[PDB]
Amino acid sequence: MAQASVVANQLIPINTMLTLVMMRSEVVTPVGIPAEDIPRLVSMQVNRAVPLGTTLMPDMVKGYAA
């Protein structure tokens, strides 16, 4: 892609509220939540465990729509 996505900088356990240390920006495929959205994702909860290096997708965050 040349669009960058949000990917997990650490294992994010199920039902954790996202913080900034947990999210990095990388050009990965398939593309996930756009990297520009990282500030809007803080304090939202993920609904599954996200391992280190996994791309964050719209369906993994509770309450996300964009």
Residue type, 56: L
Resolution in A: 1.9
All domains of the chain in start order, with CATH: 1-66 (3.90.1210.10)
Tokens describing residue 50: 């996200």
Q: How far apart are CA 65 and CA 62, in angstroms?
A: 9
In this structure, how many other beta carbons lie within 10 angstroms of the beta carbon of residue 32?
23
CA dihedral sign of residues 48, 52, 58, 63: positive
